[PDB]
Amino acid sequence: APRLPQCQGDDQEKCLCNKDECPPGQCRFPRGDADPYCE
């Protein structure tokens, strides 16, 4: 499992989407009480 930073919102490099190892761009952030999903 690679050592990845935490995602922000449509990223430059590979990062954790909530707790999911996800490629740059595809980490999506839904509103309210919904957790960040890897697309």
Side-chain angles (χ1 to χ4, degrees):
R3 289 181 71 182
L4 297 180
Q6 195 68 38
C7 293
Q8 292 180 85
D10 195 275
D11 286 87
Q12 292 180 276
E13 294 182 270
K14 192 181 287 182
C15 64
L16 291 166
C17 206
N18 187 54
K19 48 169 178 180
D20 293 279
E21 296 195 281
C22 193
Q26 296 294 83
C27 183
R28 299 305 176 195
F29 283 74
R31 292 181 180 179
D33 287 277
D35 290 272
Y37 65 89
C38 189
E39 189 178 82

